[PDB]
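Example (one chain per record):
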Amino acid sequence: GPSDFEELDLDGEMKSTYKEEHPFEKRRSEGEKIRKKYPDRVPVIVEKAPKARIGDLDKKKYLVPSDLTVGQFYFLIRKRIHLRAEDALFFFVNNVIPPTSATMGQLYQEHHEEDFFLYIAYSDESVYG
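Predicted structure:
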């Protein structure tokens, strides 16, 4: 009975141009192969939320050391966006902001999709939209 509960759109699928443009069969094949070849790294797709007003990421596909913390990945992306120090940046995994002390391997292990990719959306806003 979640119909009588407000879920704040935290149950919806975050948009991904990557998923819309590449068929699941090919994505899953690639993610399974990359996980088998590089077990101590995890594949991550990083894309802008639709309403974000923030610098673009030239490259969206990352193969990340599993022990890299979310905070470290955060600062790396801030630098690659060329974001000013005083400007805000938020990550969302399935619409919720992850802890910066988690590792990317943990994030992947708990939240990767059935194509074996972890999807992260980023925005200047604290709510995904």
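Caption: The chain has four helices and four strands.
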